[PDB]
From a paper:
Here, we investigate Leishmania donovani bromodomain factor 5 (LdBDF5) as a target for antileishmanial drug discovery. LdBDF5 contains a pair of bromodomains (BD5.1 and BD5.2) in an N-terminal tandem repeat. Bromodomains contain ∼110 amino acid residues which fold to form a bundle of four antiparallel α-helices (αZ, αA, αB, and αC), connected in a left-handed topology. Two variable loops (ZA and BC) form a hydrophobic acetyl-lysine binding pocket containing conserved asparagine and tyrosine residues involved in the recognition of the acetyl-lysine substrate.
In addition, we determined the crystal structure of unliganded (apo) BD5.2, enabling comparison with the structure of a BD5.2-bromosporine complex. The two (A and B) chains of BD5.2 in the asymmetric unit can be overlaid using SSM superpose routines to give an rmsΔ of 0.98 Å for 139 equiv atoms. Each chain adopts the canonical bromodomain fold, comprising four antiparallel α helices with a prominent ZA loop (joining helices αZ and αA) containing additional helical elements. Crystals of bromosporine-bound and unliganded BD5.2 are isomorphous, and the two chains in the asymmetric units can be overlaid using SSM superpose routines to give an rmsΔ value of 0.65 Å for 272 equivalent atoms. The clearest difference between the liganded and unliganded BD5.2 structures results from the implied movement of W263 accompanying the binding of bromosporine. In the absence of bromosporine, the side chains of W263 adopt different rotameric conformations and partially occupy the volume taken up by the compound. Significant conformational changes in the surrounding aromatic side chains of Y201 and F256 also accompany bromosporine binding. The conformation of Trp263 in the unliganded BD5.2 structure is similar to that of the corresponding Trp93 in the BD2-bromosporine crystal structure. Overall, we suggest that the bromosporine binding to BD5.2 in the crystal structure is an artifact of crystal packing and that bromosporine is, at best, a low-affinity ligand of this domain.
Residue numbers in the entry:
A (entry chain A), B (entry chain B): 162 to 300
Amino acid sequence: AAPPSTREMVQLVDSLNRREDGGAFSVDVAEAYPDLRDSYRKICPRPMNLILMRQRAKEGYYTSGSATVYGDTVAASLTRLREDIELLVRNCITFNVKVESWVTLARSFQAFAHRRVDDFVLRHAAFLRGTTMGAEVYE
Amino acid sequence: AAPPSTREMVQLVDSLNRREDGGAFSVDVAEAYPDLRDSYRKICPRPMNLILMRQRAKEGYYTSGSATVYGDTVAASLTRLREDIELLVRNCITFNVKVESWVTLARSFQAFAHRRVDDFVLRHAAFLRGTTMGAEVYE
């Protein structure tokens, strides 16, 4: 199948912004909390949020060069975007581990995000129908 | 005319916990984030949250000694509780000053909390009906 366009990838990332999340995954923590940045970066050495992900989508980072677009399964497709989703969730759960509202939100976003990517892959790549889904692998 | 009981004060404070707030105003930021303890104390040196406020209620702080229970207006009643609500709000806004959603939530809570106190005052001191309400004046 043809790779998704960058516009399609941007639309996909845009679709990951849920009003229910209240901008939780869109905020650059290091910029918004300068006095906690060192403490945050200790626990979360790698930045990730939906602003960075939309920049990556717009640039072709998820769909160009060495990026895996279609893998041998749905789960194994759009690996760079899946890794970013996984890092967003990992950072949230690790740093906010003692706050149940945050962890619950993070897990809800994780499941939602992988389902959205799964659906997107299947819309573009019918040859991957019935293979392992990202929603089944990630958790 | 009788001051509220300690149990009534504890129930009032507990009524300030909203499910939708996800523990925003109940979490002890030091306790949930033990390694941020000293950093937080530096930004918000006088902590306030609904757990501390419930403890203060149990200790009789909101109605004993020099406390103003019923003033000349609703807004002028239960001043020590109102002062704690205000500190809770100020600390939230201080810490989250670069995150507009947090500030919006803190201001939403401020109004809700004062209105809860206002309604409580009017149930215990119906003579104050028609006087200035704290929800209008504490902004």
